[PDB]
CRISPR-associated endonuclease Cas9
Amino acid sequence: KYSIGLAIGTNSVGWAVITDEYKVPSKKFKVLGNTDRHSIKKNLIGALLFDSGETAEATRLKRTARRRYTRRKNRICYLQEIFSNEMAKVDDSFFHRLEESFLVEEDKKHERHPIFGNIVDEVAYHEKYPTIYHLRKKLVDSTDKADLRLIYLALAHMIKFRGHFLIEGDLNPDNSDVDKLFIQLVQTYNQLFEENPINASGVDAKAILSARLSKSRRLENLIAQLPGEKKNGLFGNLIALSLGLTPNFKSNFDLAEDAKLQLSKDTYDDDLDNLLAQIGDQYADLFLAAKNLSDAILLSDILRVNTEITKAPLSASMIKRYDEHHQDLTLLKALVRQQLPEKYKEIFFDQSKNGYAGYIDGGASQEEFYKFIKPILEKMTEELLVKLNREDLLRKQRTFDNGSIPHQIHLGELHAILRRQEDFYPFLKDNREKIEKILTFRIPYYVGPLARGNSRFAWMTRKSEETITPWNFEEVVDKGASAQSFIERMTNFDKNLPNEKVLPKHSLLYEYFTVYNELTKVKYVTEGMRKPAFLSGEQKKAIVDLLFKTNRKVTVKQLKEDYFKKIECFDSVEISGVEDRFNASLGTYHDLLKIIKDKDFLDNEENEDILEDIVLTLTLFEDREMIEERLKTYAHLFDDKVMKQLKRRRYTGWGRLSRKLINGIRDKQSGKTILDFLKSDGFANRNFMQLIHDDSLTFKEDIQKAQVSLHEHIANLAGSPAIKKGILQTVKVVDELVKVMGRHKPENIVIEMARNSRERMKRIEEGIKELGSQILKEHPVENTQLQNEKLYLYYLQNGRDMYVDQELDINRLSDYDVDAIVPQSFLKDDSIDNKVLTRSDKNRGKSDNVPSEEVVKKMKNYWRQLLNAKLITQRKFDNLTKAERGGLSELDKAGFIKRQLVETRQITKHVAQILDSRMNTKYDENDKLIREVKVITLKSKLVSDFRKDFQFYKVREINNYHHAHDAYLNAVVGTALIKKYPKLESEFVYGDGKATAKYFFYSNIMNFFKTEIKRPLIETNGETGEIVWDKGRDFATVRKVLSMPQVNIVKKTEVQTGGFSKESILPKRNSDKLIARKKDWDPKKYGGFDSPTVAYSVLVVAKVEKGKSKKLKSVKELLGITIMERSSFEKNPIDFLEAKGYKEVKKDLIIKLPKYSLFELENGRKRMLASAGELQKGNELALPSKYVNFLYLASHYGSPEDNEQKQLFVEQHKHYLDEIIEQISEFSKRVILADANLDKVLSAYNKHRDKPIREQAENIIHLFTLTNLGAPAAFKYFDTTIDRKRYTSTKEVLDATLIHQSITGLYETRIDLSQ
RNA sequence: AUAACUCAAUUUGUAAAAAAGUUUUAGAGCUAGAAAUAGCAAGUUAAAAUAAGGCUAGUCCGUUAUCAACUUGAAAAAGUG
DNA sequence: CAATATCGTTTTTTACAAATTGAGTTAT
DNA sequence: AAACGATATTG
């Protein structure tokens, strides 16, 4: 009877139904409602359109913040309860006056002045401590009893903005010694390098190093004062290290191995060892003197103050900003009074402008302020331009860059103060430790929410049932159980033994397994032997003992040279399981050898269980203390020093397989586990896959007896949730396409699926740094410039030709080429991973393969550097060099040309497996599946070529029909292919010398559609002789369907979700639009929110009052039920509406009208709801095919003959231009009703009738955005911007007819809103 | 087409933290003038909220997914041409 | 009532598991 | 990152 074609997209599912002649049936569907019609004819073609599914990411970030906010509230709430009793004596109303600081005087309960509750004290406080940092410093330094209130403020400010937790352990501020500490580096160097000492030279390390520039410059500046020493010289890189940077010590010391050290990465103790153990331990006291100068200079850029003057150098640093800002602003006033007085009001009164007023009172950033007076200053000062570059000019203390500041330095003052004032307040002494905890304490990430079983999100497990707090957390939260659950709730079960947890990737047993499985198919021959042979049991264990347990990685060259030669005495050997080196390696054995320094223990086979628990622990837990905790049992087996280093050794990653599978389950026969068979299987050297599939053994069936919704099922898949929206809708479409054919399943279903600025500047910034290249500090760029492919590429290649070797010219990009590495005529990859910039695609070598071996030779060296500079990926590097493995074999070639029309994407196959198992559900007599329906899958190239080649052209911007057209051409091409070539079923249909013919064949698979290349009019399958294509009638019946104007389009109506409103918190204003940020906060006094999201409009017919007397008038209107209001409304719709003003509401006439709800009006004009307030265009323009194809060609400047018979088609049919405008205008005037817009278009067209046919078509294609279904949008007719006519009312709809559609549009229910 | 491993890149989902930003109030503006309006001085800080809120009352939850109509359902979802 | 213009919270860091794509080894 | 629905402003 029939087949179904689908096109699955993120915003659309197009569908078609086709009969055996490739025709698409029409049919009469019932039409429900209260209308004149009881039926309608509908062609079974259409498309569902829908807004994108969104990721949970924004939802998550909002969520994680919501919680940061409720918890910083409880921090202050902890602090305040401690203070309550002694503060209820100094000042009854203090913690209240704070609470209501936000209220206008009128709504206040206590005195307006928060701190002291009168004007004279409050005024005085502000005079003495302009900023809270003034108060922080005094409270830390001073010894005087201080006011409980001024103490409680300093403390809360520290707790309420406690800075970051990115450093572990304790930070101690101690500069002062920087000059002596630098001269200890220069001394404890010149000891070692006796020959060529560095002149300490009274060089000002102090200033150069604690200057306010970058690290990478403070370095240049410091080797600038050192004569005849390079910034890459040994002392050069030490200084980079002392400064916090990541330098590379390799070329100094002649190493083959990279030696980079970041003092404040957690592997520094292990990397320095790896170096020192290579260069000698007589260099320990050089990475020592560079650590000493590091601890005095770590926090330069935050501190800016000699810590000899104050235990409070962070606040002092801030008071410094204050004084400077004051000093500099006094001076900047004076200077403007003298020199540019006309412009003074502007700078200092005007908040509109980014003057000092716009800085302070407006909304102007430091950046925008600094951008405004750069000019003014130099047109006038010398010192202020110094400060503006440094970004140090009229600084505020609360700023975007305080993200540096660790919780440790604020804990610093927080501590100082308590110590100071516990001398006077007994309760600050008794509670000093509670209060540092509030600053200090932080729920560990591996615990998560502190839920009591109303958190979907939560997993932590309670050691008790009390309330958790920063002080009782250890004793009430079972942190270990939680830490474990954090990881184990996310890890895979062994798919094979689903009861069993996958082992740690780095499990000693796991690695043994991984090596054996790979060592059991290593073959080898000598000269003497008749055939290549597997390894013997005995051999493996000797290979494993001598090679795997002394080298991290074992080479084939080690195998030949180190085992065979020196244990077998073969001068020759030919190995056949591995290449170059062994994929598997006992990574963990050597980790543990280097640490437990006892070979005999790791081998000893009774230690197995323990060492498998040590690694599990090293993997489950990344908290070093908890690791210590877990490892405690075994303290007795290895020295103090050896536990200190086991705990630091952490692992991540999980296996794919369990312990039971590998070395647990036995063969009944053998009493041998898998690992036993890998370790020795005699003459057969069976491998895991095999072992699990050979019926000679117990294993396959020990496994088989261990095995096991739709919406749930689709959401559990792996891909964008955007495409998973398509997937559901495509299925739901298919079930209505089945219902519509009277519950008859198709013979066939055909599915095809479809496929910035910041991340690029970091890829280059980082790239060029590591490369030691001047190109940035020589042609600065910005984030948004690198969206130019050619510019991006130029910079990713160090301004250098990828195929030649020679600078390129930033000013000649437009003359050079973006060549594809593996050519575009194999791989339709057009990403950075397959593109290169070069002065011509020529220099590549052959058009017909990877870049030549000549080129690979010359360039390889550079490609490596770019690879090492993360300026090319491994994928790109590997393609680039592939010519030096014979490049593209005539079978790799064939490989890709099949890949071009065969879907390999996992997600598409998931789609097919679902549709198959849903269509095919009945079993035969021998009890295998009866496959009633074939699920064909197609790449999107087939139907695009098919469209190019027979001139069924597509132009997306005309209307939404092409989604449906593609799905029809998918059912057509799809069913034809597997009619003509039933053997391609193995490749396209879901379920269970030669290379050049595979190519030529797949290359040409689609020929049977054509009459010449000479093929017969009628095409047939040679075996069954069934008809597959009648070139004399079938191309005609395609052209019919394409030209068919009534195609079923349908926007998915959708209840809106997300933010209540816009986020912006607006000044006060009289306006019923404004929304209360909290119940008591009338926005007429406090400001608040505008722009709520309508979750859905709702038709109210009721009565409202009118005029002084409260005469009931009668109304029918659309009321927008906002997202906030939604839960209220649904709980009691009448009550909600009554309180809005409505009366005698007719509850049975209440229509939910989601976004997009459809309305047909007067001349088949349609509108779709956007809001209770604004309508969208609801009509499609059915442009004739002749005009579509005209517009394709015209706009598009085969070969010369056809690219001429189709250019002479354009010139001959130029009447089509005026005809196409005539079309848009009969439509626009019937349905769009944008008089002035239509008339600027008519005008716009007429002026440009004098311009090439190509140009005039490119821009008629833009005119369709006047006529496009959905929200109006701006477009240009040439240089004529035509702003959007919008429908800013929903009244006209209120007596129109509501159309309620099925997903397919086929079934309807039209209601005639005249009631 | 599947399975283990290797190397790289990506995607999805979760938790813990940070800095700003905004909004009201507080930080006595001053000297003229009846008045509207001038001149000058000031400005860097702070409290609080940061989805309204919710009952389950947790140092929890609140912006993802899912949604034609009619009948049936809490619901998912079924029945309906 | 209709044309036109303005508007939209931003950014950091740490820890982790899972698919998937695609170059390679070994296998059903 | 737009796009498009909410606002104010404006004619």
